[PDB]
Design a protein around this motif. Structure first.
Motif, mmCIF file in Angstrom:
data_model
loop_
_atom_site.group_PDB
_atom_site.id
_atom_site.type_symbol
_atom_site.label_atom_id
_atom_site.label_comp_id
_atom_site.label_asym_id
_atom_site.label_seq_id
_atom_site.Cartn_x
_atom_site.Cartn_y
_atom_site.Cartn_z
ATOM 1 N N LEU A 33 -32.481 -29.536 -72.697
ATOM 2 C CA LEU A 33 -31.282 -28.835 -73.140
ATOM 3 C C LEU A 33 -30.020 -29.545 -72.665
ATOM 4 C CD1 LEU A 33 -30.334 -26.516 -74.779
ATOM 5 C CD2 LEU A 33 -30.452 -25.039 -72.774
ATOM 6 N N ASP A 34 -30.017 -30.034 -71.422
ATOM 7 C CA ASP A 34 -28.859 -30.775 -70.927
ATOM 8 C C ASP A 34 -28.628 -32.041 -71.742
ATOM 9 O OD1 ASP A 34 -28.306 -28.918 -68.906
ATOM 10 O OD2 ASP A 34 -29.715 -29.879 -67.528
ATOM 11 N N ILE A 35 -29.703 -32.773 -72.042
ATOM 12 C CA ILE A 35 -29.579 -34.002 -72.812
ATOM 13 C C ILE A 35 -29.135 -33.710 -74.240
ATOM 14 C CG2 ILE A 35 -30.891 -35.936 -73.766
ATOM 15 C CD1 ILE A 35 -32.408 -36.133 -71.212
ATOM 16 N N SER A 36 -29.588 -32.600 -74.826
ATOM 17 C CA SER A 36 -29.135 -32.251 -76.171
ATOM 18 C C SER A 36 -27.659 -31.868 -76.174
ATOM 19 C CB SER A 36 -29.992 -31.120 -76.737
ATOM 20 O OG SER A 36 -29.919 -29.967 -75.919
ATOM 21 N N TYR A 37 -27.214 -31.132 -75.151
ATOM 22 C CA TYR A 37 -25.791 -30.828 -75.026
ATOM 23 C C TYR A 37 -24.969 -32.103 -74.898
ATOM 24 C CZ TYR A 37 -26.411 -25.780 -74.542
ATOM 25 O OH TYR A 37 -26.689 -24.452 -74.771
ATOM 26 N N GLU A 38 -25.435 -33.051 -74.080
ATOM 27 C CA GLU A 38 -24.713 -34.310 -73.923
ATOM 28 C C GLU A 38 -24.721 -35.121 -75.213
ATOM 29 O OE1 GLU A 38 -22.893 -35.361 -71.488
ATOM 30 O OE2 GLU A 38 -23.293 -33.709 -70.102
#
Lengths: 539, 126, 228, 46, 59
Positions: C2-7
């Motif tokens: 989820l963090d990587i998708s947000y980034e």
RNA sequence: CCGGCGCGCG
DNA sequence: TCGCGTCTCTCTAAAATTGCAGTCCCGCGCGCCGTAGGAC
DNA sequence: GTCCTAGGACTGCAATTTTAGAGAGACGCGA
């Protein structure tokens, strides 16, 4: 009752018992006030004997309670663990356990006539018939039975609730009787006690054999060892003048017992079908409240009108007759001794309250004993048979349905309950009862809701209740003319086990109370005939 | 109330809630059954008050309730005010019974055994 | 993830159905259907490249049918309707019908489970997927039990045919033994919940011994307080 | 009209006289096709 | 039924054969006793007499 | 530092 | 020798009133009055 | 004097209150 006092030094104890110690520690001249093998029974100044199946914790607890010398089969470091002043090392504590007890109490068996009885039944019945018969002769006699112990007359002894007394307990108990004037004694020579060595140091005069059958499932031995277990009782038959043989011939194992010991010892035999025996009944009449048996003895033909039930107690009557013929007892006292006994405690003790039926109590908690008792009830001619039974918990889980199966197939209406639920929930046990007939507590309770109970596949009725109290209340209330109501599983003891607390509950007294007030419940318009009760204002 | 629980056996044929005290149950049965054991099995055939209600709620079988309600609803349907109002009770009861099964709520909690007490600083009438 | 998708979306590359399906593959097993449904709502009312596909509907349905508490039959039914209305762009696969059969079986909507099992038959594997390797209370066994209990014997025979064609042995849960020691073979004939004559007495002692009464492993049939 | 009560039970014997009375008082102790097919359903036929 | 490894009670074998005789199905009755011999299961003696009488009655 | 009752202002 | 409308209830399906439950703008200012009862 | 001290207006709706509807067990009269 008088408690005899015993004082003996440790050195004198070993020499009297002729025990060869492996090694001796401490003082050999310590005064010993008693001998105990159990930690919980050790008193201050007593002698302690340590078993091989009990750990070091038993030794420490015994020393706290006042143990001064310890007899153990293995070396124990006493300089840092035990406060005892002496330690004795012997090869076999269990064998010396009887040896130490006999010499400490001056071997009380020598001054009293001890008559031995063995068999699968009547161990308590024979002792009481003999005792209140020897008493007909005027000789003081006592009781050595699993049910209860008596010094002489009516003075009961507060026997600990254990089915097999140890050798030290037997020696200590006998010494207490002889100190109070006891002259004769009869002991239960069970196969377990004879084999284990609990009766090695007891002098037996007369040995009585009733029946040898494979019934005790707890016996840790084979058939031959079981036969040889009771053979030790008759293997001591040496002196012809002092000893007599009493062996039942009807049992197929008669020929094996009669050959043990000195053949010159007189043999007195009793049997029903076999007339070749010295004692054999000629004609017997059975009734719901008394038994009339016509017996033939070498001294003469006796007519007996005894209150014992069925024919299983006839052998005990015959055994008392056989022992009476063995000791040459006059026939007049034999009639009085047999007829005096009406309801042996803990064994079919009939509860009579001027009713048209009978209420007896048997200690049978095993399938074989219960099956034999229910078969014996049938020969007494009951119009309808009603049975109340149960099973314990945390144990004997394998054969719960068999008791209720035999009850249903032998009795018409059978109430159900528990014997001693313990920590296990009684509802599970009561459901396990219905497993042998095709019902469950779920289905049975479904029957209860619609207030209707269709009978079994053979016309027999079935009702159930959790607690034995209301169950036996209803069973007593449903005694009728010619009917028999059975309550079993408890017998001699008067305790109840729920969870961990051992409640004090007596079945005989409760049955007495139930028979006391049966009238008012039935006469007030309540249809106590069967569950559910048709109350006058409930339609 | 007669017959408060079902998961334990009984031996009487008292049904419903008898307004009048049973004459036999007042003197006869207690005298015959004494006091201790009688009280031991007392609260299994006759009881009163909120304790009886809590006992009834505790031993309820909710799935049996749902099935009986559904079958009674079908029986009513296969046959007009209270013929419908009884149906709405059945729909309401099986709807009510379903929610207890899937949640962690117990129907006997509707009768209180303990009474929580408000903190004092919120009640410096209550 | 989820963090990587947000980034990734912060850097200028918006997430497509692939990334959303990857995220849903973990959300569907959290025991809370609302997380997967929030992701699904984000997908459904978004751009064309974010629109759900068959895998997305499968993930959300799986999240709803394996919920910890509360009833989710209405939610699964509405999701099925939404997927049906999207037919021009989405079509089902074997997992869709397996999940729907499982859901409509556990909630005793038997006829819908029969419809979706007929649909599932046309796929190879089929009942093997529904069996779920015995996990999740073995939905295939539950389907067989539901067919047996309501006397839908023709459908039970069809399910047996499907399992035979799929080389699927009948699991022990499907062959549970009734109170009268019967099974699905004879449980729907006119003698209900009762035993036949059999020509002799029943050995109840053997039954008591074989059920674990010697070691105390027997299952007592007594009612007990609790919602079980 | 007491013969109408017989439908509540299995009617054992009865019939002549007083048997109906005794039984009622003792029963309280226990207490075109060729045209039909011409219509057709259309369920599922969008 | 027997292929599963079971063995019914003797009376049921008597009643199923009796019904077939009443219905007039002798071909089944001879078949019920034909496989019974091969399976090794015993057959009641009185059941043997009545089926023998039936095959002697039709000839 | 709580609630009721009465009177007012927008 | 029963048979017959039917005397006297009998139990419930279906409306027909009928007694609660709930609700009824917002925001300010000021004053007065509580907090009671009984044998000492 | 007092110091502790124990009765609107409207809507909505399920609950009584019938009204009715058939209906039946025992029956005085009666064929």
């Amino acid at each position: 009752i008088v408690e005899p006092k015993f004082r003996l030094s440790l050195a004198e104890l070993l020499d009297e018992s002729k025990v060869v110690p492996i090694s001796v520690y401490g003082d050999l001249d310590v005064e010993i006030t008693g001998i105990q093998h159990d930690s919980r029974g050790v008193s201050s100044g007593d002698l302690f004997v340590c078993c091989e199946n009990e750990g070091d914790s038993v030794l420490s607890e015994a020393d706290k309670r006042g143990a001064v010398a310890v007899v153990a089969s293995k070396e124990i470091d006493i300089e840092d663990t035990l406060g005892c002043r002496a330690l004795v090392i012997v090869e076999d504590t269990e064998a010396v356990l009887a040896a130490l007890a006999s010499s400490f109490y001056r071997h009380p068996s020598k001054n009293m006539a001890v008559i031995g009885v063995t068999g699968t039944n009547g161990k308590t019945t024979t002792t009481y018939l003999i005792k209140s018969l020897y008493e007909a002769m005027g000789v003081r006699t006592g009781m050595f039975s699993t049910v209860s112990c008596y010094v002489h007359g009516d003075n009961k002894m507060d026997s600990p609730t254990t089915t097999s007394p140890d050798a030290v307990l037997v020696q200590s108990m006998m010494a207490k009787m002889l100190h109070n004037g006891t002259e004769a004694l009869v002991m239960e020579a069970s196969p377990q006690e004879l084999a284990s060595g609990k009766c090695d140091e007891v002098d037996f005069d007369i040995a009585v054999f009733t029946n040898l059958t494979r019934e005790d499932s707890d016996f840790r031995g084979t058939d031959e060892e079981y036969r040889d277990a009771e053979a030790k009782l008759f293997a001591r038959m040496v002196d012809p003048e002092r000893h007599r043989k009493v062996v039942n011939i009807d049992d197929p194992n008669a020929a094996f017992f009669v050959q043990q010991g000195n053949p010159d010892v007189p043999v007195v035999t009793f049997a029903m079908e076999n007339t070749k025996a010295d004692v054999h009944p000629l004609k017997f009449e059975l009734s719901l409240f008394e038994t009339q048996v016509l017996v033939n003895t070498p001294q003469g033909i006796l007519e007996i009108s005894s209150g014992l039930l069925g024919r299983h107690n006839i052998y005990n009557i015959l055994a008392a007759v056989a022992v009476g013929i063995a000791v040459g007892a006059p026939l007049e006292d034999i009639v009085r001794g047999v007829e005096e006994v009406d309801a042996v405690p803990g064994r079919c003790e009939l509860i009579d309250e001027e009713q048209a039926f009978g209420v007896i109590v048997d200690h049978a908690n095993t399938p074989d004993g219960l099956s034999r008792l229910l078969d014996s009830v049938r020969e007494l001619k009951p119009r309808r048979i009603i049975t109340v039974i149960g099973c314990a918990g945390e144990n004997e889980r394998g054969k719960r349905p068999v008791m209720t199966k035999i009850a249903t197939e032998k009795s018409d209406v059978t109430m159900l309950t528990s014997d001693n639920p313990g920590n296990e929930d009684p509802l599970d046990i009561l459901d396990d009862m219905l497993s042998g007939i095709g019902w469950t507590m779920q289905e049975y309770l479904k029957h209860g809701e619609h207030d209707y109970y269709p009978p079994l596949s053979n016309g027999h009725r079935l009702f159930l209740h959790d607690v034995r109290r209301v169950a036996v209340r209803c069973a007593v209330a449903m005694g009728e003319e010619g009917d028999m109501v059975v309550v079993a599983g408890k017998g001699h003891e008067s305790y109840q086990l729920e969870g961990d607390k051992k409640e004090f509950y007596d079945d005989r007294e409760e049955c007495r109370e139930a028979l006391q007030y049966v009238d008012e419940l039935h006469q007030a318009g309540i249809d106590t005939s069967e569950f559910p009760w048709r109350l006058p204002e409930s339609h | 109330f007669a017959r408060p629980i079902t998961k334990k056996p009984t031996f009487l044929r008292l049904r419903g809630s008898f307004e009048y005290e049973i004459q036999s149950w007042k003197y006869s049965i207690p005298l015959f059954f004494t006091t201790q054991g009688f009280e031991i099995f007392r609260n299994r055939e006759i009881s009163t008050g909120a304790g009886a209600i809590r006992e009834q709620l505790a031993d309820l079988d909710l799935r049996i309730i749902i099935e009986n309600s559904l079958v009674e609803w079908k029986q009513l349907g296969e046959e007009d005010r209270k013929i419908v109002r009884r149906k709405d009770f059945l729909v309401r009861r099986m709807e009510l019974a379903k929610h207890f099964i899937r949640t962690n709520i117990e129907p006997e909690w509707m009768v209180l055994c303990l009474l929580p007490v408000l903190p004092p600083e919120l009640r410096p009438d209550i | 993830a989820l963090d990587i998708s947000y980034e990734m979306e912060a850097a200028g590359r918006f997430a497509t159905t692939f990334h959303f399906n990857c995220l849903l593959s973990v959300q569907a097993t959290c025991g809370i259907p609302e997380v997967a449904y929030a992701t699904f709502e984000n997908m459904e009312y978004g751009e064309d490249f974010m629109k759900p596909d068959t895998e997305t509907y499968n993930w959300v349905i799986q999240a709803y049918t394996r919920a910890d508490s509360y009833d989710r039959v209405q939610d699964v039914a509405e999701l099925l309707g939404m997927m049906v209305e999207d037919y021009k762009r989405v079509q089902p696969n074997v997992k869709t019908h397996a999940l729907l059969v499982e859901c409509f079986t556990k909630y005793c909507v038997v006829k819908e489970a029969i419809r979706h099992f007929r649909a599932l038959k046309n796929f190879e594997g089929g009942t093997k997927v529904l069996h779920n390797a015995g996990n999740f209370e073995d939905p295939l066994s539950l389907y067989l039990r539901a067919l047996c209990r309501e006397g839908r014997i023709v459908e039970l025979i069809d399910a047996l045919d499907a399992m035979r064609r799929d080389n699927q042995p009948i699991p022990p849960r499907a062959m549970i033994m009734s109170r009268k020691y019967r099974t699905l073979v004879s449980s729907w004939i006119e003698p209900l919940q009762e035993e036949a004559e059999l020509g002799y007495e029943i050995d109840y002692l053997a039954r008591y011994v074989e059920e674990g009464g010697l070691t105390g492993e027997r299952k007592r049939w007594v009612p007990r307080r609790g919602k079980t | 009209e007491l013969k109408e009560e017989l439908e509540a039970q299995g009617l054992p014997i009865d019939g002549t006289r007083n048997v109906l009375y005794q039984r009622v008082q003792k029963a309280r102790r226990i207490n075109v096709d060729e045209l039909i097919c011409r219509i057709k359903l259309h369920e599922g036929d969008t | 039924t027997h292929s599963l490894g079971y063995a019914f009670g003797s009376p049921l074998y008597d009643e199923i054969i009796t019904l077939c005789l009443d219905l007039g199905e002798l071909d089944a009755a001879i078949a019920i006793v034909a496989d019974m011999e091969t399976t090794g299961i015993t057959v009641p003696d009185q059941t043997l007499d009545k089926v023998i009488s039936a095959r002697q009655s039709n000839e």
